[PDB]
Structures are given as structure tokens and as C-alpha cells.
Amino acid sequence: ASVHGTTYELLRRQGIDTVFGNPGSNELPFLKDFPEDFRYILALQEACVVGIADGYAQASRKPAFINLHSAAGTGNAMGALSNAWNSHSPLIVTAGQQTRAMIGVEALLTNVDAANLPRPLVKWSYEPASAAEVPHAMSRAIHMASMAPQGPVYLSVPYDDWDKDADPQSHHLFDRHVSSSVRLNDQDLDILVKALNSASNPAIVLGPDVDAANANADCVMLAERLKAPVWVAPSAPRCPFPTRHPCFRGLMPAGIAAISQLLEGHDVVLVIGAPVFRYHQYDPGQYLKPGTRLISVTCDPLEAARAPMGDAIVADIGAMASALANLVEESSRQLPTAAPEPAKVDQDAGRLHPETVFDTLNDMAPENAIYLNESTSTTAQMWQRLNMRNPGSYYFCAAGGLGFALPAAIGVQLAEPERQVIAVIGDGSANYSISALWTAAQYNIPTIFVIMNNGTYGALRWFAGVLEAENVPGLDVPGIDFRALAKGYGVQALKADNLEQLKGSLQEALSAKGPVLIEVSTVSP
Amino acid sequence: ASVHGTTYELLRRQGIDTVFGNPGSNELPFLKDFPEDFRYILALQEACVVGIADGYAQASRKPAFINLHSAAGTGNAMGALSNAWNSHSPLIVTAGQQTRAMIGVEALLTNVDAANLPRPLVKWSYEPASAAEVPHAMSRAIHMASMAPQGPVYLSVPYDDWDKDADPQSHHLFDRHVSSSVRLNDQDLDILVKALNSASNPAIVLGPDVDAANANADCVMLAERLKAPVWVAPSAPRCPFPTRHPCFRGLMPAGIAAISQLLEGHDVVLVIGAPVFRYHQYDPGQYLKPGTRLISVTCDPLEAARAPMGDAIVADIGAMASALANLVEESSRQLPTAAPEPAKVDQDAGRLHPETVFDTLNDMAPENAIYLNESTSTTAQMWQRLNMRNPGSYYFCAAGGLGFALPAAIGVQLAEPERQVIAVIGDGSANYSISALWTAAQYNIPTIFVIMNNGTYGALRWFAGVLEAENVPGLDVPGIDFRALAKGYGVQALKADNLEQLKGSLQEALSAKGPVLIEVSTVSP
Amino acid sequence: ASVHGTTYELLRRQGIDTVFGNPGSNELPFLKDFPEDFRYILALQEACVVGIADGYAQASRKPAFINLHSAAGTGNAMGALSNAWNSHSPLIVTAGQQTRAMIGVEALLTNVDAANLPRPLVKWSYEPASAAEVPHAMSRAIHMASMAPQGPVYLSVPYDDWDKDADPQSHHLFDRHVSSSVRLNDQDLDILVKALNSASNPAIVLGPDVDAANANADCVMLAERLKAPVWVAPSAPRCPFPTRHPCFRGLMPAGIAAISQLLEGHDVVLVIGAPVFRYHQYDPGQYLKPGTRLISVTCDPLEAARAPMGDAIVADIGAMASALANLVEESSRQLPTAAPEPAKVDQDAGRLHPETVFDTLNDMAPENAIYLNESTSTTAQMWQRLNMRNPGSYYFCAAGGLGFALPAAIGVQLAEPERQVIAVIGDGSANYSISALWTAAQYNIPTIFVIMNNGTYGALRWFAGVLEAENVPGLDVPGIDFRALAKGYGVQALKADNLEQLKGSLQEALSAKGPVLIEVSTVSP
Ligand SMILES: Cc1ncc(C[n+]2c([C@@H](O)/C=C/c3cccnc3)sc(CCOP(=O)(O)OP(=O)(O)O)c2C)c(N)n1
Ligand SMILES: Cc1ncc(C[n+]2c([C@@H](O)/C=C/c3cccnc3)sc(CCOP(=O)(O)OP(=O)(O)O)c2C)c(N)n1
Ligand SMILES: Cc1ncc(C[n+]2c([C@@H](O)/C=C/c3cccnc3)sc(CCOP(=O)(O)OP(=O)(O)O)c2C)c(N)n1
């Protein structure tokens, strides 16, 4: 067998059937004779390739495989890798290297010091020392991406390796099963259960690893049992709980003092599947107030180590949420009461308030819609205004790196063909990965893109206000016609300048058989 | 003085007056109170920011200053840094970091292990240990980028540092002059001159550091004196010699055997300002044939170390080319005869052959035009067909990373307002950095973009043919309307489906007062 | 030819004839069939191997070649590499790797992520992608170590590579000559000469790269011409000037304020071959006082970039010192007057004052002795008390890393068989690399080791006093019998408890035919 044939066998035997890629010359020997049972999803720039693969991996809850061109292709993807690191996305990134006989002279397209290029944004990064090692290296990459805490990995392969003979002993790689599905030992889990059972006023805080594990339903049972309010940890990349369940409290503000104040009076705070905490703004104060103690369940030792407070347990979120939900007592306390519905903001016949856009989406979208957010100034309103009943219903760039949602929404729609994906993306953010639109057109992946056009980088105007910063350049982005960009890449395009046109455009998009972009004129901040 | 005021003083005193940027929240404290004598050039994605700055630095022959947002912004620019490394471009890349009080908890937008992110594509990468160190660190970055061999550098600055008090001793940084303008000592330079004077059949090979040094005219005098043919080193990122001078031979093929065969019978080959050599294709054979010896003058120790043959001298290209051109004897041999003009390829009334496009550009463009190439399958024809008399007339992505020429052509046009820039870019390559078009529209930088539309990644079809590789996916890019993309970003757009329309479109673009994009329908390979 | 035969041919053709090593199993395929024209110098621990090679390279002014065992052997040498980085020592460090078929599984003795292990203490670090690349990689290592600014390099080689067939084109590597012997261009050098000629009160400051370049005599001519006082830059690893020449001023204190005060009233300060400056203690103040400007000539861009003041020129120290010494005018000012001799410290019939030891060494050692210092509390007195007329007469660990002088003194003595080496080493410092003594015994390298025994880490007691730090543990080192350690490793040993015994012991050591260790009882601080 060749290294090529052994490698595609390993991939298929490990459940991989799709290559997300932008091809180049060092990759043609890998991509030739492409197997008939695989599919190749082309995107036109590598931030788009990786973002599509990342949405697909997060929604499918399985690793996604990427092929990029040498150093420049890998480099164009590194902002996308920053988000994938923070979302624990299981991405297997491969890149082609020059032929081994050409690496010493540093021929054009040599990836110099290749394994160092994507650091520190990968769990494992490697270039094999010989051709016959490639299948074993690929096996290491698959399992490094897939074991808890999941995350991106990188493998560089000289182009001459693929046609060499494989080691016949590589067959032992094909069916390896590697598990990190673990939970706290019995004795210590009993101590934790008794602490939860004994709390007088527990609170629960959930992060994105809950949605990744599909632990959402177990966390609903846990919160119902403990009769406890549930918040989503700050800077949330996913939604871990039904947002109209009576226990739901919403998204935590990303500030130290704000969070300790919110938790004041709760004696035990159980955090599951989140860093403690992904703060953002400067908001100094106490980490926790007197009388509150915190216990964190995390799948990531790096999260456990850096929490400034609380106890921690490093374990699989699926296994721990299931065990806690089935072991805790049913408290006799009253179930929390549901938050009230948000109010309708006054809306005239002109430009749209963001609040109106989300209320209208909530009114018209199917109950199993999946939303993506890259409308940076409107996140609080989006979290209040969209009823997300089901798992896998929300994604937001986990490292704050713009250029995620447009491509990721195409990958999510590919992963979930029966759930309507609706990406709500600011006019600024839409540009970072605009060419991803072409992949939705070419493959007919029916994502709906809602572009919130207010002419400016609104969140930066907000942060500049907080800092009291004057005379900052570069904050305005006038003069972009999103209908024309959609036409450029083959996507049907609509414009909504008022509420009547928003409703009409959404009814048309929801009825369409392909991807649709709607440019919405929103109010300037 | 604050760190902010001291830093902008250092920049202005070191000749920096322009910030190329895409802003973010960790950078607002740097960008506030932006000085009235500086300009800020916004681009919508960071590969575009860096590419614009890189074209500006290469054409201006001085460092360019960039400001990006944390890890994700820096990561989105890393393919652009791969080209800047290979072109020795003096780029000062700064990125904002979280406030120092928030870095430990890894708050959102913390750039983790920041100085390692852009490695190995930078000469120096650093985050200061305190606020007061920032001006000194910035001074180190300026000089590291600017000293031979020039190249990109990286500095990460916590956002809280800018408002702190500066060290009053920082004033000693402002007027430092650092020189690497050096040449080989007298005794050894005399030995080299005598070897050149004594050669029976010398050849000269020039690389991009000649154009960077503006050593082109000195190299013409040197070649006239020695009566020697002149080639451009393979994979050429710049043009170092007038392409219709009688000594000019053209671009070397990027193969080991091809180059030794070309040099056969030349007793001494003097390479100036190039790696030895930036080969690309697999073309095994002899590095040099019997009877040829090679001497390399390079500004980069890494180039001298990795050459597989020849002697080398590590020195400034400007100083060495000037000294050699003024010291060598006038040989009594006959001056080489000029290459003949290329032939006209037969052209019907349909889609354009690339050869027709370059002949027409050559006929109609001003004699001081500047060209950019990212039409990967047509490079040989472009080098034969365009008469480039002047320095600074050609750029091509030095690491082969697509997404360079569209933004770089805007930076070059900003650097050279009186020279018409014409970027010739394939339909595939045009997508990587398509949003750069918006910066040309917003600032009215009158670059002309010629998009060669043949529907496919043509160079990859070529390389697949060489490899005899069948069933490769992802090679076609149908369905892109470049006129609509230009409209999307505010650039006037024309289409040329035949030669009559090409001539008309070029006459209109050449007469226009702003940037123009022409979509040219070219023949499919 | 095999890779083994081609590599030893490359080494011999590049002037390498000695391997400093501690062998291991991954290195046996390199070391077998060891060529009869090479010598192998064994040391018992890798800090000793590297220190011996470093003294040999610094004294011979040529690269030295080292072979170490995998990761653990390389790791044991990393404190020695820290000194070699700071002294710009041209060291070629090679380490054996597992066979390529065993690297993936991480067999015992695999050097994981090998090229990253010695960073940041090396100029270049690499593992080749195939066996046939090894000779080319070795060529890169030789030239990277040898080009200005010289320094250590690292190459890792899988053990199976040595018996593979070499590429016949590797012969082009054997005779490559690479030069960095460069100086500032004529026009700018004339500007610098005119500034020196015009100065009213110039001062000269010299660093270790002057001694490395053997530029000492040219710097004496330069100082005589300019009639200028000469200081040695602080934290001096070498001696660049005759210490009883009338212009000599001594070692600069390593403090910011102390140095600006020393230079006050000097209008132009020319620094050659030093960082600006290797300060140590906290001594805040002005970098330079009003009226003094500084010009630095350095072979190291990293030094030029980080100087907090002055202009800089990056060039070869030998070439620049020769050009300046031959171009400057003979000033009509009076030649500086020689510093007076140091005073005799009162000495009773008991334990020795360090001052007495250095005066006695100066009285009895030959005029061409070479000294090494690792007696950390006595450096100021050593620099006042030893007349060092000749180049290559002093070495002190350039990064402050103890364990350098004992092994380095053996390498220096091997490099300079006709110059008596005398290492003056504190009782604390002597332990770090004590096993190096065995190499002096086995090869009969007649270094004299003078151990200053005061029972304590004296310099740390001093620094603790400056900090006013009380209750610091670990400062005393009682209970070491250095005569017994010397016996353990086969070196003749003497003890001196008073001045009479010091004189007798030195007369015996100076007359001996092999290495001698003298334990001197010195006064406690
Ligand atoms: C790759 C990249 N580059 C730049 C930034 C900086 N940045 C951003 C940030 O630095 C801050 C992000 C942040 C921080 C906390 C919470 N949410 C977001 S936001 C932004 C403007 C986006 O504008 P738009 O999409 O039109 O939406 P709004 O008008 O609703 O705000 C920018 C530019 C970024 N986050 N990522
Ligand atoms: C960031 C990035 N991603 C991918 C590649 C791979 N690649 C390329 C390469 O891997 C090879 C590049 C090369 C190698 C030697 C010389 N010149 C170029 S070329 C290419 C197609 C570009 O298509 P287009 O612009 O339409 O022009 P042609 O039709 O005339 O060819 C691609 C996609 C690349 N070079 N850079
Ligand atoms: C590898 C290593 N480990 C530890 C140190 C720390 N250190 C040292 C340092 O941290 C400081 C070094 C310094 C700083 C400036 C100038 N000169 C030296 S000195 C020292 C004691 C050495 O004792 P000894 O040899 O008996 O001489 P003295 O009695 O005359 O002082 C020690 C231990 C060190 N420098 N290097």
C-alpha cells in the first residue's frame, strides 16, 4: 500500500469523510486519486476554509479535516485557529510541505520551521521524519484533536511522501478507539453531590463545553432537581441551556465585580463546561463575595489551573453532567420563575433597531433554527430576544476573532441540513471572510445571512466611550454594497430598509431553496 | 510625558508618519488622540492591512508601521507575513494586548504567548515587561525591521501601558541613527574585482534586494563594464534590471538542472541580492557544471549559509553594487546583443490570450508604470512582454502566498502617486484579499486592477499535469462576477470579453481619476 | 560516498579537526570509523564538554565542533550555551537523534521537538528532513556559527542517517568560502573619521568582540592617535587592551549612572565591539550626560537595536578597527598618563587577601600568561592587579553562568600550548563543572587551577548587603576538600594557607609538567 492509500483508509476508519480545503501545489500529491467516498469542500481563502470546518465540527460534535497550502495558506488561517482554540474545536489541520529533497535549499513554498508556525493555537503540531511515519502521525493528529479538551492540531507533510510505500504495520492504527469519557471517582463524587444537596441557595453557571458534549438536557434536569437559577458564563461561544426555561437567567456580564455581585447570596455556585471566567471589560472588585463558594467542572486542565478562585474537577462534561443530574436529590424549594418577555422597543417606519430585528427573527424563524452572532454591539439584545429551545442553536467567535460567523454558518448548515441556519453579522464583520459566500452558492448550502448595516464599527465606538477615548481613527465603514458582494459570489440578495421590507425579505429567504443574504439598514449608534 | 506621547514622538523622529491598521478594543488607547501629523489607512481585514503596508514599504524603500488587534488580528495577517519575510520587507507590526491586570485570568482578547504567535516569520518578536519599557521596545522594533537583511518584526503592548508615565531618559531613543551600509574590506574587494576583470565569460544574476537597494543603475553599469549577460534569479519578487537593456536575458527557470545548463560555459557567475537559488520545481541535476564557479553577494546570512555552492559575501547590496560598478575594468569584449521582441500570438475575436493582454498593456501603459503579478500561470509571458525600464516596476508575492498583489498594489500606488500601478491578478488569486478594494475606493488611490478570468486555478492544473496527477478536486472557480465585487466595494468596474473591449477598457481606466477594475475573459487552459 | 564520509570530508575541508564530546548510543554511528586525522576530546559531563570547546574556540578564533547525546546531553549543556551566546562563541553543537523509524513512537532517547530544545541560546537550530540532507545541514551550521555575529548553532541527526548514501552534488559544499569581513562605506566612514578628528575630548570603550577579532593592536593605534582614554565595557568577558598602556582606564562599573558620570565631559564616546551596555546592578540615572554623544561599532544587529542611546554601525570589528586606526589624524593633544600601580594591601602570616593572590600571580606568572576568572567577589581587584599585555589574556563567563572557567581553561590551554593558563576560581564556582579536571589529567593539558577558598558565595553576600536582605539561606559552602577532588580526577594538588605557601605552591605549579590545582585559603568576607 502507498502512504496515500493507507492514510485515506485510516481517515475513513476513524469516521472522516470530508476534506475542507483550498488546494496548492504541495498538496496535489495528497489530493490526486481523491477517493470516491470522500467529499471535498472548496473555499476561496483559508480563514474561510477553517471557519467552515469549525462550524461543521462544532455542530456535528466530531472532528473535521482541513487541507491548506504550506506556510502562506496556514498563515491565512491563523485568526480562525485563534477562535477554534477557545471553542475547543476538534480540527485536524494538514498542510503540504516541499519535497524532502528541496527543503534544505529553502525552495519556494518550503514551510520553514513548520511545526512552530501555528503555535500557540494548537494542541499538537508536527512534521514526520520520514514518509512511512505519515499514517502514524496522522493517527496522532486525529486523537490529539478528539481527546478532551478537544482542539486544533497541525500536521505538515512533504509532498513526496504520499507515493512512498507504507509500513504494513500501519494497519494497527485503523480501528483504535481512544476514550476520555471520564468522571470523578465515587467517593469524591458523593462528597460533591452531598454539597449540592446541602446548599441553601445554589446557582449553576454553564459554558460552551456543555453544548459541545450535548449535556444540555442533563443540565436542565440538574437545575430542576436543585431548583437553581442557571446563567451562561460570560463571552459565551455557544448556548448550553433552553433560553425560555424557568431557571434561565441569561448571559453573565463579563466583569469581575459584576459577576460577584450577581452571585452574592448564593452559597454554592457550580460552574460546568466554562473557564472561570472569560471576563472582558475592566471591572475590578471581588472575585466572589463573602458567603459564596465556587466549584468548577471543566474538561481542560488549563482552565482549572488559571481560575482565580474555587475548587475544580477536570473531567468529561457529558459524563459529569449525566452523573450529577441522576444523583442529586429533588430539592423541596420552589422552582425558579421564568424571566419575563423582553419589551418591544418603539420602532418607526425608518431604519431598524436591532431589537426589532431579533424580535422579528424570533417571530418568523422555525423553532429549531440555529443562530450565529457576529453583530458585536447587539449581543445582549440577541440573547434576550431569541428563544433557543434546542442544543446547538448559537455560535459566536470564541476568541472574539471576526470572520468566523459567515463561514461557520455554512459549515453548521452542512452539518444540520434540516435546521435553518441564520447568521446575524455586522457590516464590519461581514468583510473579514466575505468570500465564504461563494462556497454556500457553489454547493447550494442554504444558509441565510442577515447583515446589520449601521455604517460603523459600533462596538468600538462603545468601548471608546467607556475609555473616554477621543479622536480615534478608522471606526467608520461607509460605502459597502452587500447586495453587490452577494451577487459577486452567486448568492441571492435582498435589502430591508424598514420593518415592512424586513418581514417581506425574511418570508422570501425562509422560502428560498438556496443561500440568501439580506442587507438590513439598522440605526446608527 | 506619557508612553503614548513618547512613542508617537519616537515614530515621527524616526520618519514614520502613517499607521496601516484594522482597529480593535486593545488598540483604542494607542489610537486615541491620534496625532494630526500622522495618517491612518484603514483596511477591512488584516491580510489586506499588511499587504498594503508591504507594497508601501517595498516601493518607498523605508519601514512601514502596522497596528492589528490582538491574536486574531495578528493571525489573520500571517500569510501576508510569510511573503514579507521572503521579500525582506521592513514592517513594524504592533498588536494590542489585554490590560496587564487581566492577562493572568486569560480574559477575552488576551494574546496568549504573544511573542511566539508570529514566529518563524519575523526577525524579532516581543512583549515588554512594563509600560515604561514600551518606547525602548518600539525603538528596537524600528531598528530590527530596518537593518539589513530587512524584514518584519512584532511588538505586543498591553492596552493600559499607553497612559502611564514614560521614562524621561527615553529621549535618547528619538534621534538614533543605525547603519548597516557596509561593504567588503579593501583587500578582499580587490581580490573579487581582479577575479571579475579576469573572467573570460562572466554572467550576472540579480535578485530582489537589488531593487530594494535601488542598486539597479549600478548593476547596469557593472554589466556594461563586464560585457556580461544579466538574468533575474528564479521566483523573482521584484525586477532588478531594465528588461530591454541589451544585456538582459530574462527570468531564470526555477530548477537546479535548468540553471546549471543555462550557466554552462560561464566561468564566473556573480549573484547579487538573491538567495542561491529560490528553486521551485523538482528538476534534479548538477548545481553548477564543470568550469563554472559562483560568487554570491547577499545581505542575509541565512541566504549565504544555505547556498549549496559558491563563495559568498554578506554585505549591503547598495554599497557593494556601487563599489563593484565603479572599480571593475571596462572589458574589451563586445556588448551582448539585445533579445529579440516576443512574437505576436494569433488572436481571434473571442476570449483573450494572456500574451495579447500583456502586449496590449505594454502598448498602452506609461513608460513609468508599475506592475504587479498574481496571475500564476502567465508569469513567463509577463516577463517577456512588458518593457520595465525603471526601478520599482514589478512585484510578485515573494513566498508564493496569494492575496498579496491586490492590497500591495494599493500600497505601491500610495507610495508612488505619479506612477500608474497596474495589478494583473488571476480570478482565483483575486479572492484572497478582495476586501482591499474598499481601501482604494475610500482613499481614492487610483490603482488599476486587471482580473484575468479563466475560471480555474490554472497553475495548479499545470503542476497536476507535470505530476501526472488525476482526479484532483477543487481546481475550478466558476461563478464569480468581479464587476459586482468591485461595485460592492465602491470601485468603478469594466469588462473586456475581446480585444476591442480590452483596448477600450484600458483607455477608459487609464483616463480615470480613481481606482478601476477590469474583468478580462481569458482563454481556458 | 556515505553521509558519514561526506560529512567528515566537509568538516576537514572547512578546517575542523577536533570533536569535543561525551558519547552516547544515538552518536555511535557518527563516531565509528573515526578518522585518523581527527582528535576526540572526552569530558565526563556536557557542561564540561561545551565549556572546553568554548575556551578552545574563543582562544583559537575559529569554530569548535561538539557532539552530545540526544536531549539529556544537550540539556546538561544549556547553561554553558547561555555563556557562549553572550560571548559570540562559534560553536557547532551536534546531537544524535533516534533512528527515523523509532521517532514516531517516541522510543527512549528520542529528542522530542529537538530544534526547539536549545532555543533561545542558538543562532540556528535544525533537524534535517532526510539523510542525504545531512551534509548540507552541517554546512549551514558551520557558516551560521562562523559568520558575524558569531555564536552557537545546533544540529540534530537521526542515527540511521550516517550510513545512507550521500548526494554526489554535496561536493560543492566542501570549499565554500563565506565572508562577513565588512566595513562602513567610504562616504559614511569619512564622516565618522572627521567626527573623531574633530572631537575635543574623545573617549574609547572596548568590548569582547575586539579581542575576538584580534583588533587589540589596532585599537592601541587608534587610542594613541586620538590621545584618548580607553575603558573596557562593563561585565567584560574578554580583555581587549593592554592593561598597563598609558591610555588604559580599567573596567567600567556596570551601572547606568556610574557610566554617564565617568563619561561626563567627553564629547564623543566611541564604543567598539561591545553591547551598549551590559549593565548589571540597579543604578538609575542618565544614560549619558549633556554634552556627550555616543557612537557604537558592533558586529551584532541585536546589540545595535537595543542600545538605549547613541548612533550605531553594524560591521566587522577587525575591519572597522583597522580602517579607523589607519585613517584618523594624529591629535596634537598630550597622550594620557598611565594609571598608577595599585597599592599593596597589608597581609599578615594567615589567610590570604585576594589582593595578595593577584599581586603574587602578577609577580610570578609569565608575561604571556592567560587568565581565567570565576572568583566572583574579586573581579575589580583582578583587573587592577594583573598586567595583561597581550591579546587573548582574560576570560570570564559572559552570561555570568558559573561552571565556565574550569573547563574553558582546559580548552584555552589546548588552543595555546605555549602560553601558561591560570584559572582563578572561587570555591563555590569550582563545583559546577568539577569533573572537567579529569580531561586535563587524561590529555595532560597543563592548566593551573587556583581555587580561592573563603567558604561562602561571597558575591551573593555582597549583593544581599546592597539589597539589605536578611535571613537568606544557602550562602555558605563549608566542608569541601579541593585537594581530594583533584586527586579524585588525577590532578596534582597543593594547598596554600599563607603567603609563604602560596609562593612555594606557585613555584612548584609553574615548574610542573601537567595540570596543577592549588587550594588557597582566602579571607572570609
Ligand atoms: C479579526 C478582528 N479584527 C478586528 C477586531 C476588532 N473589533 C472588535 C473587538 O475588538 C471587540 C470585540 C468584543 C469584545 C467583547 C465582546 N464582544 C466583542 S468589535 C469590531 C467591530 C465589528 O463591527 P460590526 O461587525 O459592524 O458590528 P457592530 O457595529 O455591531 O459593532 C472590531 C473591528 C476583531 N475583534 N477581530
Ligand atoms: C494563500 C495561498 N493559497 C493557495 C495557494 C495555492 N495556489 C498556487 C500555488 O501553490 C503555486 C504557486 C506557484 C509556484 C511557483 C511559481 N508560481 C506560483 S497557484 C494557485 C492558483 C491561482 O489561480 P489564479 O490566480 O486564477 O491564476 P492562474 O489561473 O493563472 O493560475 C493556487 C490556489 C497559494 N499559493 N497561496
Ligand atoms: C550557574 C550559576 N548558578 C548560580 C549562580 C549564582 N551566583 C552568582 C551570581 O548570581 C552573580 C554574579 C555576578 C553578577 C555581576 C558580576 N559578577 C557576577 S555569584 C555566586 C557565588 C560564587 O561563589 P564563589 O565562586 O565562591 O566566588 P566568591 O566567593 O568570590 O563570590 C553564585 C552562586 C550563577 N551565577 N550561575
Ligand SMILES: [Mg+2]
Ligand atoms: Mg456595524
Ligand SMILES: [Mg+2]
Ligand atoms: Mg485563473
Ligand SMILES: [Mg+2]
Ligand atoms: Mg567563595
